[PDB]
Amino acid sequence: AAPARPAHPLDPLSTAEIKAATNTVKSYFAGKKISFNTVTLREPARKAYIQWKEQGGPLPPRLAYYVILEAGKPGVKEGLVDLASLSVIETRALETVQPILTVEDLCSTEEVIRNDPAVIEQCVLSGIPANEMHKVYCDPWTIGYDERWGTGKRLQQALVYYRSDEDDSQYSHPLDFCPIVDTEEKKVIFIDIPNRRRKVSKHKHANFYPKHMIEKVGAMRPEAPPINVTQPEGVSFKMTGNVMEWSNFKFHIGFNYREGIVLSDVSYNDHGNVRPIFHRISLSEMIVPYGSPEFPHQRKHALDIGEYGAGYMTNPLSLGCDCKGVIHYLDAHFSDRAGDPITVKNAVCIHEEDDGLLFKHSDFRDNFATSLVTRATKLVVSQIFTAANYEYCLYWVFMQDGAIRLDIRLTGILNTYILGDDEEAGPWGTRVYPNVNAHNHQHLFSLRIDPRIDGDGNSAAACDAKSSPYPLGSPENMYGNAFYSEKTTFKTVKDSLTNYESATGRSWDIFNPNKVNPYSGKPPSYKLVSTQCPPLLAKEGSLVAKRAPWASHSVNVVPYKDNRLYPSGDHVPQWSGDGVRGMREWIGDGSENIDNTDILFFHTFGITHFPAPEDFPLMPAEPITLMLRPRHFFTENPGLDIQPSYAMTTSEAKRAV
Amino acid sequence: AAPARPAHPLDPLSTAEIKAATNTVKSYFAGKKISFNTVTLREPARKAYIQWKEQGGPLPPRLAYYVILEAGKPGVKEGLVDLASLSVIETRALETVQPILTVEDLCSTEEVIRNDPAVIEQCVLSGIPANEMHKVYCDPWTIGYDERWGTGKRLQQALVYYRSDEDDSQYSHPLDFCPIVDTEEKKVIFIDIPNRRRKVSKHKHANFYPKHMIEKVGAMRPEAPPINVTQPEGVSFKMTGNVMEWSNFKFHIGFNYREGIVLSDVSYNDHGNVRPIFHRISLSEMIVPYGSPEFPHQRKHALDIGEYGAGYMTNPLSLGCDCKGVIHYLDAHFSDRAGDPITVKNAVCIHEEDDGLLFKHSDFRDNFATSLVTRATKLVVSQIFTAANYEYCLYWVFMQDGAIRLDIRLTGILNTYILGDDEEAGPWGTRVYPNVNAHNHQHLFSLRIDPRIDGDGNSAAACDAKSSPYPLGSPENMYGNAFYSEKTTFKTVKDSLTNYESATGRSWDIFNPNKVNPYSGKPPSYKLVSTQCPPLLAKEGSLVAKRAPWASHSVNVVPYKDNRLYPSGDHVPQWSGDGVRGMREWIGDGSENIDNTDILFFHTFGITHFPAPEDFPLMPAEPITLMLRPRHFFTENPGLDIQPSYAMTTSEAKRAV
């Protein structure tokens, strides 16, 4: 009667497992009116997984984690189902939190506002007649946090816009007011109205489809000639279910409602010696804090991962458009509020691409006739998600020097608020179009690394480039040129709380202090090379800083414990930021050991964005990247057994003349 | 009798012009034994070029700059030839400088050392028998600067290595001593010998060709399946001689012995309004300072551009290997010591590539059926040069959002010195292989921008992201989230001398204070976004800091004057770093105006490298990048008239169901 076991313990729940879980929960709560918010894999404990994979150990139980609401009860209930026995094995009621906002939760808000008499009244005061409510739209946001209601009601705020025609881009025409909606009652409970009213813009909409551009600039550019990419003999990667093998890497590609892509059990086959690198790597939280202090714009600091979910938000991807070439896709499966499985087709795309030169060297002695050149190929595992106005394109990239990179491209549309005719947008925003204020904001991400560098028992350090402390003209530093790398190994959590520093070109190592490279004498490591590391601009004690305690440092290293995934806590919406949970709980008093143990390394990276008119009405892609590169992991360049694109030795060159 | 005029005043000298120039100079110096070091275009004065191009002004004279040596005379002579009249129009003797080391200058050093009795003696003491000198090799370097000789003799230093077989990579087997060679006499004048001798390594060479890898790891990887890129309808760019037009950009692609690629007269056609952006952009100098203080390693700080020349060093590029696709090549032409033209075929490659997504947005309201996606194409203008052990791959990239990026990939081979059996390499280097010490070093580059942002009269600024100065809980910043961009406009040179700062996410604007964006109210600008900006680690007053006065700040802005190209001075080798020339001259007392005038913006960027065994025996490519992006230059995203890869409007989606 139980669902079939998966091919691999880290595989996401199948649609059958989802329905089995929600049947089990409905039965457990029979006679209660409940709705499903989350039904997802509860991954095996790290010890249990490693013991199963590498030690012939017990098969970990297949478990689903659920979150439900119950009509007329505050907060949520959450728990675990054991799928093999179709039973609820753990359950608890959390009356004072609110959970992630699903697509269904968000979907109904527009019609609630269009039909609400107070909202209609504000639209009419703003210059939109009462019988034109079909032209009023809103983007349904998390309320984020509002101290007037805490978590006592489940709330959204509606950022309201106007379209003259359904095909317009509405973001040139924000309205001035902000309805607050009770998600479960489907009712507006309050409208924040500014002391200074600003009526709807009379300008044309700032549009971007070809029909609009033809009107606006006369004509489109002609179709460019095509650039065609083919792989007539197929690809070099091999997938077995969700397990990838490519260029000596092996790893499991997972996916969930919240993080989106989760890469697990990542190893590199070093000439027959299969060496672990990471147990798990993913994006674990975000925050996108805006920088206008005016009310109610403090409530714009979406933690998109915890409040909406990079999986729930993810686009179905298309062949030729989003990622071109020969592509392997994976689907994603979630539950809807009724407990039925839902599918997002082609949620992940996997492909391999040309990546320019891997390495080259030529000898000047025979005018470069002696020459070796080897081209690089990269493997890319990608998704794209839409958070209302913005699109986040995520690319996990594996490379043939053994490095792993995460590239992000931000696109979509600026968040916009209305600007009066004579109103100055600065210093907190930019007038990107008439009557349009695009507020300053940051995009910050929390990369969660559970490392196993060359096996278990790891540490982390900051590496700072420093001049020698001996002065110019000393016997020790006669010409003043000496410099070295100062490695500060983190002994306790408090030591790890560190920022990027340009002054020392700071990087961070994650290494195995139990092992030694036989050439260099240093421990094997992967080094985080990451410079897009903004300070958190919101102050200490701010709503933003309190709700995202991870974001105030570029690096936070804590001891591993099971279920330490989400650093702003498990249920993010409407938390005030007060209390010991998430990263604040894991840091504790800062005194716990993190040298030579099981650690978790959370890195904060991202951008700070001051809008300009180039970003409007649709923003060109803005890049973010970080890299984890092997240093002292190998004893020589690991790509040298890749066949060169061209090689001629000195003796060969001599024979050719 | 004169050479034909070029198609364009910025075109490099043709082979005919080169020979015409060296004939003219030989005639002028008839009865003197002279040799040519440099024969290159003297570009028109900026005012003369702009007046010719945009104002129907005078045709600038076609001029060649030369540098020659004369047997038995110290230093160099330099001057100008007017090509139309075949006459020397300017000449002077500089008895106390030394010029760039050409391929011919460097080529003879190995045989000088193999034949020198003192060198042979040191090879025998180092364990190499006297009859095996054919196995001894050296990389011929600039002496850089040695206070024992100043500029009084023209000198090289030879970094000596040993090969057991001609096809070895010699860098696993450095020897311990350093011969000093008089370039013009072809004689060793001194050998620096360490107090502690280290004999040649007995280990196998660390090799990297397929035949070596088969011995070392058993077998190569099988040939991967191919990834084929075709453009069956040709390319979208158009070249007219050296003038490029692509995606509304127009510019002139020049090339010289020193800088390599020089992009000039760069404009963007904004719907019929052709708007200047830069008059000239290039790399103007480098320095690669090593961080071992031990003698004689202070002399390792090559200024590769000024001391060897990115043009003289440049590789002939090959189709399929270096840059793949449909390619347009340019050749380079220089003079040899006899005054004859020499050609490097396919020195520059030009092509266009897929560059992922340009922009995307989809509407959640119809589950993303309403969707627009436009793919990006980039145009790449590239060269690769070899400086003995290292290869520098340079890519100038134009993009369809109007941004311009410079990407660099470093590859080739670590500089190595010998390490005794029991000798510790740290803190100044790493043991990357037995008996091999790879010293710490930086690679620093000076990007020279002569801007004309939307026309003449420009300024520069630092932009720093800052929290509001009002505290949390104030009426001005109630929730502590307010933040803005503090723009510091540089009024005098001293103001501009600024570093990258992580604490504020610093960027720099180059803008036209005479113009205003009609939406934002800000001046049009291109913003330098650049975070790979190391501090110079060598101390103030060091040889390194004195010879590269530009490298101590990330940004140096000075007034434009003609012939302010090279910031460590015109003749770099063996300058002590004392004296007012190059950037130190241009900075002066720091008081000159640089607000709203003709300015030059020199940016220092690069990396700091602590070797590891992954980099040996051949280093995987290491990336460096910076971007110049339009901000408040356009009134909206300039790529919106590119045909989308996919577009469906809301009304279209409604009709499709």
Resolution attained, angstroms? 1.7
One domain for residues A584 and A530: yes
B390 is an active site residue: yes
As to burial, measured by CB atoms within 10 angstroms (0-12 exposed, 13-18 middle, 19+ buried), residue A222 is: exposed
Which of B135, B373, B424, B483 to mutate to probe the A interface, most A CBs <10 Å?
A: B483
- The kind and range of the H/E element at A229 are strand A228-230
**Distance of CA A41 to CAs A67, A561, A566, A573, B262, Å?**
12, 17, 15, 21, 56
Question: Across the interface, do A291 and B432 touch by the CB < 8 Å criterion?
Answer: no
Question: Two tokens at A585?
Answer: 């709980």
Residues B19-34 as b or e (16 or more Cβ within 10 Å = b): bbbbebbeebeeeeeb
Which of A248, A640, A643 to mutate to probe the B interface, most B CBs <10 Å?
A: A640
Dist. CA B312–CA B387, nearest whole Å = 10
Catalytically annotated residue among A168, A304, A456, A509: A304
Dist. CA B517–CA A434, nearest whole Å = 12
Q: How distant is the Cα of B333 from the closest Cα of chain A, in angstroms?
A: 16
Question: Two tokens at A62?
Answer: 């297949």
For residue A135, the 8-state DSSP code is G
- Whether the CB-CB separation of B207 and B617 falls below 8 Å is answered with yes
Closest among A579, A170, A565, A569 to A388, alpha carbons compared:
A170
Q: Which amino acid is at B347?
A: A
Q: How distant is the Cα of B60 from the closest Cα of chain A, in angstroms?
A: 36
Q: How distant is the Cα of A239 from the closest Cα of chain B, in angstroms?
A: 16
One domain for residues B484 and B620: yes
- Whether the CB-CB separation of B627 and B403 falls below 8 Å is answered with yes
B650 vs A contacts (CB less than 8 Å): 166-167
Closest among A611, A546, A549, A615 to A586, alpha carbons compared:
A549
Closest among B466, B511, B467 to B489, alpha carbons compared:
B511
B655 close to A (CB below 8 A): no
Catalytically annotated residue among B146, B304, B456, B615: B304
Chain A, 291 to 310: residues with Cβ < 8 Å from chain B are 291-293, 295, 298, 301
The phi and psi torsions of B298 (rounded to 5 degrees) equal -60, -20
Task: Give one word for A508, left, alpha or beta, with left for phi > 0 and alpha for psi -120 to 50.
Answer: beta
Question: Across the interface, do A353 and B634 touch by the CB < 8 Å criterion?
Answer: no
One domain for residues B484 and B616: yes
B391 vs A contacts (CB less than 8 Å): 360-362
Secondary structure class of B267 (helix, strand, coil) = strand
Dist. CA B626–CA B531, nearest whole Å = 7
One domain for residues A94 and A135: no
Alpha-carbon Rg for chain A, nearest whole angstrom, is 27
Chain B, 35 to 74: residues with Cβ < 8 Å from chain A are none
Question: Two tokens at A376?
Answer: 């690089």
**Single residue among B86, B102, B118 that ends a domain in this structure:** B102
One domain for residues A267 and A329: yes
Residue keyed to tokens 């100079």: B25
Dist. CA B133–CA B156, nearest whole Å = 20
Closest among A38, A6, A50, A25 to A457, alpha carbons compared:
A50
One domain for residues A541 and A401: yes
Question: Across the interface, do B543 and A480 touch by the CB < 8 Å criterion?
Answer: yes
As to burial, measured by CB atoms within 10 angstroms (0-12 exposed, 13-18 middle, 19+ buried), residue A183 is: buried
- Whether the CB-CB separation of B99 and B571 falls below 8 Å is answered with yes
DSSP string, B398-446: E-TTS-EEEEEEEEE----EE--TT---TTTEEEEETTEEEE-EEEEEE
Nearest CA in chain A to B627: A623
Closest among B313, B180, B339 to B257, alpha carbons compared:
B313
DSSP string, A437-484: EEE-EEEEEEEEEEE-TTSS-BEEEEEEEEE-SSPTTSTTSTTS--EE
Count CB neighbours of B344 within 10 A: 24
Question: Two tokens at A578?
Answer: 């007060």
Q: Which CATH number fits the domain that encloses residue A369?
A: 2.70.98.20
**Binding site annotation covers A308?**
yes
Beta B76-82 vs B63-70: how paired, if at all? antiparallel
Q: How distant is the Cα of A591 from the closest Cα of chain B, in angstroms?
A: 27
Closest among A523, A533, A552 to A460, alpha carbons compared:
A523
**Distance of CA B342 to CAs B35, B310, B336, Å?**
15, 15, 6
Q: Looking at the 3D structure of chain A, how many domains does it have? A: 3
Question: Across the interface, do A225 and B210 touch by the CB < 8 Å criterion?
Answer: no
Please list the residues that pair with A525 across neighbouring strands.
A511, A631
Dist. CA B384–CA B404, nearest whole Å = 19
One domain for residues B342 and B435: yes
A31 close to B (CB below 8 A): no
Closest among A74, A642, A97 to A372, alpha carbons compared:
A642
CB-nearest to A208 from B224, B386, B640 is B640
Question: Two tokens at B241?
Answer: 């001689």
Dist. CA A112–CA A106, nearest whole Å = 11
- The kind and range of the H/E element at A555 are strand A555-559
Cite the DSSP H helix spans in B520-588: 543-547, 582-587
One domain for residues A558 and A450: yes
One domain for residues A244 and A337: yes
Helix (DSSP H) and strand (DSSP E) numbers for chain A: 11, 32
For residue B498, the 8-state DSSP code is B
Secondary structure class of B155 (helix, strand, coil) = strand
Instruction: Reply yes or no: is the peptide bond before residue A434 cis, omega within 30 of 0.
Output: no
> Which residues form the domain of A196?
108-216
- The kind and range of the H/E element at B620 are strand B619-631
B430 close to A (CB below 8 A): yes
- Whether the CB-CB separation of B377 and B326 falls below 8 Å is answered with no
Dist. CA A544–CA A537, nearest whole Å = 9
Chain A, 67 to 96: residues with Cβ < 8 Å from chain B are none
Chain A, 324 to 353: residues with Cβ < 8 Å from chain B are 324-325, 352-353
Measure the N-to-C terminal CA separation of chain A; round to a whole number of Å.
77
As to burial, measured by CB atoms within 10 angstroms (0-12 exposed, 13-18 middle, 19+ buried), residue B390 is: buried
CB-nearest to B208 from A409, A501, A640 is A640
The phi and psi torsions of B469 (rounded to 5 degrees) equal -75, -10
- A563 Cβ partners below 8 Å, 6+ apart? none
Question: Two tokens at B250?
Answer: 């127009």
**Single residue among B45, B78, B102 that ends a domain in this structure:** B102
Dist. CA A263–CA A254, nearest whole Å = 6
One domain for residues B516 and B631: yes
Catalytically annotated residue among A390, A395, A417, A500: A390
One domain for residues B488 and B636: yes
Nearest CA in chain A to B476: A293
Beta A371-387 vs B525-529: how paired, if at all? unpaired
The technique is: X-ray
For residue A53, the 8-state DSSP code is H
Q: How distant is the Cα of B115 from the closest Cα of chain A, in angstroms?
A: 17
A228-232 contacts at long range (C-beta below 8 A, 24 or more positions apart): A228/B229, A228/B230, A228/B231, A228/B232, A229/A324, A229/A325, A229/B227, A229/B228, A229/B229, A229/B354, A230/A326, A230/B227, A230/B228, A230/B230, A231/A325, A231/A326, A231/B225, A231/B226, A231/B227, A231/B228, A232/B225, A232/B226, A232/B228
- Whether the CB-CB separation of B416 and B171 falls below 8 Å is answered with yes
Dist. CA A450–CA A112, nearest whole Å = 43
**Single residue among B102, B126, B150 that ends a domain in this structure:** B102
One domain for residues B58 and B205: no
Q: Which CATH number fits the domain that encloses residue B154?
A: 3.10.450.40
- B121 Cβ partners below 8 Å, 6+ apart? none
**Distance of CA A507 to CAs A460, A463, A623, A629, B88, Å?**
11, 5, 20, 11, 55
Count CB neighbours of B187 within 10 A: 13
Nearest CA in chain A to B163: A650
